[PDB]
């Protein structure tokens, strides 16, 4: 049997790429900051990036301090940073560094699909720079990532900009040497992102229904396109054994575990209690987190749903 | 002001209807609640539920396949549903063939194709299919990004046109996306449903989200807090229930304080699954008559299964 | 215990700069709004400047609109105002305040600092 | 722009009196409004907000009101501890802008 917890993958000294992600509320935020404490926790001599693709950035409000596009240290600790990219104020940055025309941001800081490029940018950065130098990087990039949907738009974007680039290089007629190292870039970027031991795709889910059929349609597309994922966070069980509405709604997702555990027997599920405090601030994430590295146990770890700082 | 969408849900005026907010608060169940309730309520008028959330989940709470071609809620005469499939669309549009593939994938393929879908419709309700329009929204974040398009594609046609049969067209879809702009700032015709919970990550998103669609100049009065314990009226137990309910109330009371002027509709957590026809609109009632922790406290526990 | 210090006051000339600082405690201020509120001698409250860090937003009264600039480090709980091309009639006592998202009257003040602009 | 109109200037009250003082918004801004009491040298108190709400701490004797767009500031029955100097300010949903009314001194009369 594969073990109920993620301690491979968070000790790991080969995956350069993760992402967090599922279905909407189900716990990839919470998760991915989780995941992202845990491994650098565990490995201190590495430099990780937990980097938000959502739109609707939620790691500041988890952490409780803002971030930005300029990735900052979570404050207490030393070895992992946060970025939430804002479209218009990098679009700004690159509008004065192209200047050294002035409407970029006006134009393009809306355009649907402008949070995926940026997003895309700063992965084409770091594999750059972990080979040339010449500016900051670091080991490891954990994507908390926007639900399925457009992550899915996400992931494609190497295979889509790879096959587009095909054809416009002649449409044309250094402009075609941008086009040569963009080109080079996005291949390097669909070798890493389909080699399993570089990147992987961690699922979260809940123990429900509709999260049920959208959480198998998403890893079926993410195997499609040759993307590792063999991890499966199953957040916010109860774990209820009075109460009608506990032992009504336990008893509903004991049954749909039961579904989980069967289907996925050749992955990691992980499964995660619902906590009765709010598992925000680095102490609250950082606690919950331990229950990734080695799988929680409702009798004996059953006090710390409710040992979770109010502050 | 009256804590329902009674107002909204016997609207003669509303084309429009927005249903948005935060991942997994209940923009998907509360938008086929308000659907319903609006058909059952006007059967004189065809309701259209489109999904624009890339990740539809339409199908899966009715129980039947939706897809790009809008089709009947079985068991409703006048409420059907919309969900794009951006490859499957532009097979279609590029018959009328690797390109096509190829932008299936790109990122915004979403929200274009289902902008498109608004234009036609706009194309259509200018001359001689649906009165109401619903939409399923995707998470905050992408969201925003549509509801800027008529904007956004206004000034791009602008500077199209100046670089630049080929001028002709060019002008009717600025002209095209003008009335949707003046029509999605129209309080009458358009309005933007927020969906919550009362969580701390929740309400601080829902706050950013409703300021920002103010500074778009649409229309928000009305904010579902859904997934409530209520508790106490259980009937007095369960240190989970107790304490996860203290915490609801504590920011239910923030949420009460803040946005006076809106309809803040409270929303039960049941214990059943909201899927199927039946339970959605068993669910979908409390929109119109706000819902009872004292007296309507069975309906919980009575979702079919 | 909640408290809020405020620093940085000092006599400038016409033209010249200055950068204050709030110092809270007690509170994650992140999660609230902080707000300069000044006070001529002799005059009346005037509301100058907010920032609400939760939204990445900032707001200015017109008066020093385009000169005042207000931040924050979440990182060390403390917002600044950093005040530029300052004038005679900013002169005044300067408090720092705090608002929340919910509700945006001020219920915690510091006790003030003095900012004095003569030539 | 907008006003926040506070009546009157000054006014002279003995102890145990009730007092009253008002404040008008140019336009509607709702019940975002609070009261605030300034000591001189003294940083002010937040007394009321929402328009009627207590805040935490402060004495029962005072107490606010809200008729459109006209506010009012009671105080039941004047303590020594109460001459000073009160503030109305608003903070409107729809704006960013804080606004405070210009004061009104209550002083002791002999």
């Known amino acids: 049997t594969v073990e109920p917890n993620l301690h491979s993958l968070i000790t790991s000294t080969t995956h350069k790429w993760i992402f967090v992600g599922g279905k909407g509320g189900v716990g990839k935020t919470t998760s991915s900051c989780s995941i992202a404490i845990q491994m650098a926790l565990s490995q201190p001599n590495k430099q990780f990036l937990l980097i938000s693709t959502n739109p609707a950035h939620n790691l500041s409000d988890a952490f409780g301090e803002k971030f930005g596009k300029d990735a900052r240290k979570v404050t207490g600790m030393n070895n992992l940073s946060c970025m939430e990219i804002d479209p218009s104020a990098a679009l700004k940055d690159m509008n004065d560094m192209a200047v050294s025309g002035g409407a970029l941001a006006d134009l393009t800081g809306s355009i649907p699909g402008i949070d995926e490029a940026l997003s895309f940018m700063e992965v084409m950065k770091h594999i750059k720079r972990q080979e040339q130098g010449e500016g900051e990087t670091f080991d490891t990039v954990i994507f908390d990532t926007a639900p399925t949907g457009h992550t899915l738009r996400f992931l494609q974007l190497p295979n889509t900009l790879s096959k587009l680039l095909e054809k416009f290089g002649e449409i044309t007629n250094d402009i075609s040497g941008k086009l040569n190292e963009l080109k080079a870039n996005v291949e390097t970027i669909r070798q890493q992102f389909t080699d399993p031991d570089l990147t992987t795709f961690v699922c979260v889910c809940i123990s429900e229904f509709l999260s049920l059929y959208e959480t198998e349609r998403l890893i079926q597309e993410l195997i499609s396109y040759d993307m590792d994922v063999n991890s499966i966070i199953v957040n916010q069980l109860l774990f209820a054994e009075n109460c009608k509405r506990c032992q009504a709604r336990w008893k509903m997702q004991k049954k749909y575990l039961d579904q989980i555990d069967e289907l996925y027997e050749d992955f990691h599920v992980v499964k995660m209690p619902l906590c009765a405090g709010e598992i925000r601030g680095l102490n609250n994430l950082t606690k919950f987190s331990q229950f990734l590295n080695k799988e929680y146990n409702p009798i004996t770890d059953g006090k710390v749903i409710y040992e979770l700082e109010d502050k | 002001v009256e804590p329902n969408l009674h107002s909204l849900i016997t609207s003669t005026t509303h084309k429009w209807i927005f249903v948005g907010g935060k991942g997994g608060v209940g923009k998907t169940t509360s938008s086929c609640s308000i659907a319903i309730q609006m058909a059952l309520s006007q059967p004189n008028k065809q309701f259209l539920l489109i999904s624009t959330n890339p990740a539809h989940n339409l199908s899966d709470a009715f129980g039947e396949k939706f897809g790009k071609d809008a089709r009947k809620v079985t068991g409703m005469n006048n409420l059907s549903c919309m969900e794009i499939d951006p490859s499957a669309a532009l097979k279609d549009m590029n018959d009328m063939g690797a390109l096509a593939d190829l932008t299936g994938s790109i990122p915004g393929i979403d929200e274009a194709l289902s902008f498109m879908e608004v234009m036609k419709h706009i194309k259509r309700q200018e001359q001689g299919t649906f009165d109401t329009v619903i939409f399923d929204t995707a998470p905050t974040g992408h969201t925003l990004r549509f509801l800027q398009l008529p904007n956004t594609l206004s000034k791009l046609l602008e500077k199209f046109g100046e670089i630049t049969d080929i001028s002709g067209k060019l002008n009717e879809l600025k002209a095209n996306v003008e009335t949707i702009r003046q029509q999605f700032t129209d309080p009458d015709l358009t309005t933007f449903v927020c969906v919550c919970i009362s969580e701390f990550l929740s309400l601080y998103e829902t706050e950013r989200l409703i300021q920002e669609l103010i500074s778009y100049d649409m229309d928000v009065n009305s904010i579902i807090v859904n997934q409530l314990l209520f508790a106490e009226n259980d009937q007095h137990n369960c240190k989970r229930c107790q304490a996860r309910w203290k915490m609801q109330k504590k920011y239910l009371d923030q949420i009460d304080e803040l946005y006076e002027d809106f309809h803040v509709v409270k929303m039960p957590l049941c214990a059943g699954e909201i899927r199927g026809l039946n339970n959605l609109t068993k669910f979908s009632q409390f929109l119109n008559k706000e819902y009872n922790p004292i007296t309507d406290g069975k309906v919980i526990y009575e979702l079919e299964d | 215990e909640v408290q809020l210090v405020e620093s940085g006051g000092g006599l400038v000339q016409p033209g010249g700069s200055l950068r204050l600082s709030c110092a809270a405690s007690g509170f994650n201020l992140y999660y609230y709004s902080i707000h300069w509120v000044r006070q001529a001698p002799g005059k009346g409250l005037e509301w100058v400047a907010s920032?609400?860090?939760?939204?990445?937003?900032?707001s200015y009264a017109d008066s020093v609109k385009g000169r005042f600039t207000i931040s924050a480090d979440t990182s060390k709980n403390t917002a600044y105002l950093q005040m530029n091309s300052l004038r005679a009639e900013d002169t005044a006592v300067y408090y720092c305040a705090r608002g929340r998202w919910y509700r945006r009257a001020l219920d915690y003040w510091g006790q003030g600092t003095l900012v004095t602009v003569s030539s | 722009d907008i006003q926040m109109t506070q009546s009157p200037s000054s006014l002279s009250a003995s102890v145990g009196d009730r007092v009253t003082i008002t404040c008008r918004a140019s336009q509607s801004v709702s019940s975002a409004v609070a009261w605030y009491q300034q000591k001189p040298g003294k940083a002010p108190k937040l007394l009321i907000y929402?328009?009627?709400s207590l805040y935490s701490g402060v004495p029962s004797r005072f107490s606010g009101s809200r008729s459109g767009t006209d506010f009012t500031l009671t105080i039941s029955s004047l303590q020594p501890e109460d001459f000073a100097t009160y503030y109305c300010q608003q903070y409107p949903y729809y704006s960013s802008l804080i606004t405070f009314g210009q004061g009104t001194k209550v002083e002791i009369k002999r």
């Open positions: 929402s328009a009627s």
């Open positions: 920032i609400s860090p939760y939204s990445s937003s900032t």
